[PDB]
Design a binder for this molecule. Structure first.
Ligand code: MNH
Ligand code: WAA
Length: 453
């Protein structure tokens, strides 16, 4: 049949609909109006936005569809290169890096990172214990300090020392400005008016800053023979069991840059949304706080204790349901195929999965999809295949999922053990869109339960 399409702007087709500060939220409203699938046309390109589990369960069939690099990922590839996130599945360096790194990101590998994660989580708790009575917490700012420092220390034994600064690390200044330039180029019609030579100049300088610190990190480690159990040691020593080859130093740099992007606001967003929903749902906060107090009986949490924070895990899954912090991914058709018995696609045709809309499919979740209810995840096995996809799909799924959830469960556990929280401004959710999503200006007050560390 005829696929629905949103409003057009003459020869510009649908392109101006993404000339907005909040394109994901705009696409969600278009999905609300048009339903499970809509065509999006621009001069020279056509994609289809999927919102229903019924169609997304077919999109997630790896025999029929593979990961596409969206324009967003193609612009990020200028500095993330052939790292896992910005590689095609058919690139030799994708399969090598995947085989070498995947065992180092397992639930079981988190035992080795736990001590380092505790180091940064304790720095967060001590910061909040040390605030004066009249002061508040800038939640996304503090969560980003935690997640960046955690990936720096577990990733390559580097301390960003985010709790010791207002001003970002020079690497982060360049990474954030490079990510901004990549996202800004999406809505940039003609990028060659002489105003955009200065953007392009700044872009090349930020790439050089990122390449220089990371190449130096790798070079320093190769020299010292120092064997830290971090991802960088794993990458310098590891061999792909298929090819028998290791990663080269350039590819290792791209992997580190990719991990630092991922571990920044994409991961801290989960913690910012989780705390937002907890302060807006005080009975849910109380239930999560009762679990944290019952389970976290030692001054520092153990790996086994974090694994026993079941309700805190449910809280984080329910935050990922409503506001997944990497809210879309792109696929292409491996062969001519028919989607949902109705939508014929040619080989190469592109799909975009709109994850926030998938997570609001009433046929899966029931009518009250806007409610924050962690009890939806009492038994995560009960969720049908391809209904809950905040970490993407199949062999191209998030490699960091167990790392992100261990980090988030540990620190949210400790926060709920150590503090009562107040929504002292009655904060109005305002979701800022970058490469990720965050509750912009989210602030709370934390009152110590005066429990020692
Ligand atoms: C919450 C936190 C969080 C979310 C919601 C998340 C979401 C995603 C989604 C969705 C994809 C699939 C993208 C696509 O185009 O299909 C993906 C791919 C990826 N992610 Mn993770 N990601 C992390 C944290 C997250 N990632 C962390 C932390 C790391 C590493 C330290 C990480 C490293 C990756 C890598 C690497 C890939 C690419 C995997 C592959 O294609 O082989 N990540
Ligand atoms: C780096 C990772 C984390 C990201 C992945 C993304 C995937 C989908 C993106 C994204 C959410 C940013 C907003 C545009 C959107 C929804 C998209 O459809 N974009 C399509 C369609 C599109 C929009 N503008 C374009 C300009 C040219 C070509 C295509 C487009 C695309 O990027 O391809 C974006 C966030 C950043």
């Amino acid at each position: 049949k005829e696929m629905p399409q949103p409003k057009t702007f003459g020869e510009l087709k649908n392109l101006p609909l993404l000339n907005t500060d909040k394109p994901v939220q705009a696409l969600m409203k278009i999905a609300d109006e048009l339903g499970e699938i809509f065509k999006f046309e621009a001069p020279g390109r056509v994609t289809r936005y999927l919102s229903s589990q019924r169609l997304i369960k077919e999109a997630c069939d790896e025999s029929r569809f593979d990961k596409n690099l969206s324009q967003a990922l193609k612009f990020v590839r200028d500095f993330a290169g052939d790292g896992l996130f910005t590689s095609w599945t058919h690139e030799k360096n994708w399969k090598k890096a995947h085989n070498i790194l995947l065992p180092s990101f397992s639930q079981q590998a988190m035992k080795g990172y736990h001590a380092m994660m505790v180091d940064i989580a304790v720095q967060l708790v001590q910061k909040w214990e040390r605030l004066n009575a009249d002061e508040h917490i800038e939640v996304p700012e503090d969560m980003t300090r935690l997640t960046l420092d955690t990936i720096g220390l577990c990733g390559f034994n580097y301390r960003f020392n985010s709790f010791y600064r207002d001003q970002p690390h020079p690497f982060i200044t360049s990474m954030v400005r490079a990510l901004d330039e990549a996202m800004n180029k999406l809505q940039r019609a003609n990028p060659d008016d002489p105003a955009y030579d200065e953007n392009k100049r700044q872009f090349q300088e930020d790439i050089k800053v990122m390449n220089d610190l990371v190449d130096k990190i790798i070079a320093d480690r190769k020299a010292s023979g120092e064997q830290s159990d971090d991802l960088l040691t794993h990458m310098l020593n590891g061999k792909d069991p298929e090819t028998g080859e290791p990663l080269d130093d350039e590819n290792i740099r791209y992997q580190i840059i990719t991990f630092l992007i991922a571990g920044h606001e994409t991961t801290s967003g989960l913690l910012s949304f989780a705390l937002y929903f907890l302060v807006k749902n005080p009975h849910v906060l109380q239930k999560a706080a009762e679990e944290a107090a019952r389970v976290l009986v030692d001054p520092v949490p153990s790996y086994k204790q974090v694994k026993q924070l079941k309700y805190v895990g449910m809280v984080l899954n329910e935050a990922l349901r409503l506001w997944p912090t990497a809210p879309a991914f792109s696929l292409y058709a491996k062969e001519d195929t028919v989607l949902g018995g109705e939508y014929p696609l040619e080989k190469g045709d592109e799909l975009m999965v709109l994850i926030p809309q998938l997570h609001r499919d009433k046929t899966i979740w029931g009518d009250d999809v806007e409610e924050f209810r962690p009890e939806r995840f009492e038994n995560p096995s009960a969720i049908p295949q391809h209904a809950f996809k905040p970490f993407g799909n199949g062999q191209r799924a998030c490699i960091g999922q167990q790392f992100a959830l261990h980090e988030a469960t540990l620190v949210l556990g400790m926060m709920l053990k150590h503090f009562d929280f107040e929504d002292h401004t009655n904060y109005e959710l305002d979701i800022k869109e970058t490469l990720t999503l965050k509750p912009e200006g989210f602030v709370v007050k934390a009152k110590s339960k005066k429990i020692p560390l």
